[PDB]
RNA sequence: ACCAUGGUGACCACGGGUGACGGGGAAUCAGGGUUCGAUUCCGGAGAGGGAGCCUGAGAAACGGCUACCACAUCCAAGGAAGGCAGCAGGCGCGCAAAUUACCCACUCCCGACCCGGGGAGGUAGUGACGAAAAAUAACAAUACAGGACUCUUUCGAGGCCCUGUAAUUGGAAUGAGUCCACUUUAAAUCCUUCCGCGAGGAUCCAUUGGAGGGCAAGUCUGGUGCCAGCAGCCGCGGUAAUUCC
């Protein structure tokens, strides 16, 4: 069939629950802007590649 | 052409007021039949009781069943159909609960591929829908 | 005592009220806000009276400490200090007794007298024995 | 009814189009080169810099020697000379138009205590101002956006109750004088 | 009462509707405008719906009266007493709104009055309606990565600055919180002031929306296969989904 009215919540009920694991907390407020001003602007990147964005792989 | 002389402010101002009755978003806000027609009666939310789970079928390129309900309202009671805007959340609503239906996003017009639904359900049974989806709150015992 | 220094400013005497009123500022570097009975005993050796007619109040310490500022005054007599004086500052050191019933009691008392007329013997004993 | 005040206004303004990539990157390097907390307090001083330019440019469309051009214009110019942003010898209604956002942040308390050598590392200036150390002449202030005038610009120093100017050491040196002498000599 | 036949109107009369109290004003912002204004100020109106009055300088008064209509209370059943669109509170309607608190000390008002009264009004509690400030960490010694400053050189590595790893520490750093005393105030509580405690995952724990395009940010991995769902708009999903979980 083509999912008539039952199996609502089909894909969420059968996904595996990988646990949200933990790391040290992120900086908040003023300190958050410090740790990302330095990441973008004071660190000139010596390598090229058409200047890929921050969430690269 | 138009009127331009220092004496025609009666003709100009009377020609503007009757030609304002020809766009919709003035006329639906000033003629009063359109607020005696929407089931919210000129409001943003309305509580109502759930009569029937009903699944409408999606529009022309898509193919899925959009999970909806058949809310009848408690203020000036009228029949509406309302969307359940989340993944498993048809299961949290049961028969003859009370739900706070909201608008659906673009002012009395159906959004997306759902054919002719105008409303979405939030806060079934005085706990939130996002609280039920995220495991914050539950149904009563 | 050690470093608690008492300046004042905007001095004004008046014989409309028989008082000498002035604005006080107290500068203390690293102490708490000095008490009122510790400062009015110092204006008694500034204007040369005894600490019985000096009324100091309204102190407000600035942000950071140091100079607090309040208002204070000196009368010409203790019997003048009873006449032209609000009764609460006359009682901040004990010279007037305001310990009464509440106004919830007093209003219910007044409307109970209102429903009884003439009987002076019972316009006064209108519900005192229920205690 | 009430003796309430009822008067308040917004200090900043939100930017018109969001997410354009040239704006928020060049405005991010105002947040880090002067060490601030969020972008609401850049939109604060941009709205301050806005209303001064709006007022002054309105005073240029007036004809010359108009009385309120002279009065309001000179009252404007004396107000932003004494705050130290506009040097006094070049006082005109035109040199206020080249005055930029970089110059209003320079006269804050939070960066006139960094460059004077009271502290290092511009973020540490908030860690000394807000954390109750650094005063103006006889007034301690925990406000980083305190716009210091040029008059009281020589008088930035630590306070007398403070560690850096006085004593009665804090609870971590008192902890260190206790953790050896707490079970022994 | 006796006469005359007039008055108004397409320059919108007359009638209807109004989610119509009017205004000062508010939101907006190139100019022209558009929308809102129950709401603290001024004016009007009305105390359940109509009507009639008394007193008084002033009322068609309603925390005055008389009657009718509507709702509703006690009763020993003969009769009595009603009017919160005043302050709190309750029920109900609803998407939708506060404590049955303390006091006349302030601003003023009333009276025979320096003295009494005032749910006017002031103070607290509830308050993420909204508006203003403003924490959740900063310096270090290694340290691992970058820099026009080092050799007579792409020798060899740095004695020198910036950054993140990962640290190990530290100390005239401090707060939120806790708690004496002052101060505050009519009495207090806040706020400010100040002893004593109070930070190594400062675990004393920042979230809310997003990551195809508009529109800042991933074709990373796992799962489901036009199903479940997402998606303001275009669109994404039919067995490798940059968009679902």
UniProtKB/TrEMBL annotation, chain A:
Protein's UniProt name: FAU ubiquitin like and ribosomal protein S30 fusion
Protein keywords: Ribonucleoprotein, Ribosomal protein
Domain of life per record: Eukaryota
Chain residue ranges for the region called Disordered: 9-34
GO molecular-function term, one example from the UniProt record: structural constituent of ribosome
Gene: FAU
Biological processes, Gene Ontology terms: translation
Record field: compositional bias (Basic residues): 22-34
């Amino acid at each position: 069939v083509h999912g008539s009215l039952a199996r609502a919540g089909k894909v969420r009920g059968q996904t595996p629950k990988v646990a949200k694991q933990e790391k040290k907390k992120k900086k908040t407020g003023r300190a958050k802007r410090r740790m990302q001003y330095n990441r973008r602007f004071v660190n000139v990147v010596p390598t090229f590649g058409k200047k890929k964005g921050p969430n690269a792989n | 052409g138009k009127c331009r002389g220092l004496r025609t402010a009666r003709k100009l101002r009377s020609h503007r007021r009757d030609q304002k009755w020809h766009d919709k978003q003035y006329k639906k806000a000033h003629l009063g039949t359109a607020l005696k027609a929407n089931p919210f009666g000129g409001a943003s939310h309305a509580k109502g009781i759930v009569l029937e789970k009903v699944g409408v079928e999606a529009k022309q390129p898509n193919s899925a069943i959009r999970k909806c309900v058949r809310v009848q309202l408690i203020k000036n009671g009228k029949k509406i159909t309302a969307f359940v805007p989340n993944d498993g959340c048809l299961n949290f609503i049961e028969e003859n609960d009370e739900v706070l239906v909201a608008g659906f996003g673009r002012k009395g017009h159906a959004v997306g591929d759902i054919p002719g639904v105008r409303f979405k359900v939030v806060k079934v049974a005085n706990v939130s829908l996002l609280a039920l989806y995220k495991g914050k709150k539950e149904r009563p015992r | 005592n050690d470093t608690v220094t008492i300046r004042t400013r905007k001095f004004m005497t008046n014989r409309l009220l028989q008082r000498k009123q002035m604005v006080i500022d107290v500068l203390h570097p690293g102490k708490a806000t000095v008490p009122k009975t510790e400062i009015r005993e110092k204006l008694a050796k500034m204007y040369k009276t005894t600490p019985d007619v000096i009324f100091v109040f309204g102190f407000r310490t600035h942000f950071g400490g140091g100079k607090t500022t309040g208002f204070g005054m000196i009368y010409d007599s203790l019997d003048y200090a009873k006449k032209n004086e609000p009764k609460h500052r006359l009682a901040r050191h004990g010279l007037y007794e305001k310990k009464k019933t509440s106004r919830k009691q007093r209003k219910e008392r007044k409307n109970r007298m209102k429903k009884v007329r003439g009987t002076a013997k019972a316009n006064v004993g209108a519900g005192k024995k229920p205690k | 009814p009430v003796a309430r005040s009822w008067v308040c206004r917004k200090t900043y303004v939100t930017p018109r189009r969001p997410f354009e990539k040239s704006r928020l990157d060049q405005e991010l390097k105002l947040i880090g080169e002067y060490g601030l907390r969020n972008k609401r307090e850049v939109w604060r001083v941009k709205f301050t810099l806005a209303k001064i330019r709006k007022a002054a440019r309105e005073l240029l469309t007036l004809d010359e020697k108009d009385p309120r051009r002279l009065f309001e214009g000179n009252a404007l110019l004396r107000r932003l000379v004494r705050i130290g942003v506009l040097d006094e010898g070049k006082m005109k209604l035109d040199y206020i138009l080249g005055l930029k956002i970089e110059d209003f942040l320079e006269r804050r308390l939070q960066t006139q205590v960094f460059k004077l050598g009271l502290a290092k590392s511009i973020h540490h200036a908030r860690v000394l101002i807000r954390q109750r150390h650094i005063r103006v002449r006889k007034q301690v202030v925990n406000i980083p956006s305190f716009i210091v005038r040029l008059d009281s610009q020589k008088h930035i120093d630590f306070s007398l109750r403070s560690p850096y100017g006085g004593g009665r050491p804090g609870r971590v040196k008192r902890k260190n004088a206790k953790k050896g002498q707490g079970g022994a000599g």
